[PDB]
């Protein structure tokens, strides 16, 4: 088991793909879709 071994890299790649799917959801909540603030509560207090 080493970086050189192709099979070991494939096992790591499968773990990375699962991690990437989870990471996307967490990142999108931080992202703001055309709004003053990502937080729903922060927009409510500052807007009518």
């Amino acid at each position: 088991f080493t970086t050189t071994n192709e099979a070991f890299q494939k096992v790591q790649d499968a773990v990375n793909n699962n991690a990437q799917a989870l990471s996307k959801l967490a990142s999108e909540l931080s992202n703001t879709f055309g709004a003053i603030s990502a937080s729903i509560g922060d927009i409510i207090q500052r807007l009518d």
Partner: protein, 97 residues
């Protein structure tokens, strides 16, 4: 203190007070005067009392209650047209006291 001292200028000659980094208590200023009319655009009048902004601009002038309708962005009256204009893009709260 400048707002509470001396004679306020006319609407065309309105003085400008700009606050960038200070804690503000709008209610305390409102309590000293009596507010006959409170109107706000692009934000709630209640919301303006407790929210944070990069900068706050306050303009103080003597304006009579009788011509309040003339001083509006929607109004085409001369006082809004020539004497004073408030930028539409940034949220603006107008208070008559």
């Amino acid at each position: 203190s400048p707002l509470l001292s001396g004679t306020p200028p006319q609407v065309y000659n309105f003085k400008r007070l700009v606050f960038t980094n200070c804690n503000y208590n709008l209610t305390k200023l409102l309590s000293l005067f009596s507010v006959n009319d409170f109107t706000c655009s692009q934000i709630s009048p209640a919301a303006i009392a407790s929210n944070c902004y990069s900068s706050l601009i306050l303009d103080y002038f003597s304006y009579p209650l009788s011509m309040k309708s003339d001083l509006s962005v929607s109004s085409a009256g001369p006082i809004s047209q020539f004497n004073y204009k408030q930028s539409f893009s940034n949220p603006t709260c107008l208070i008559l006291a």
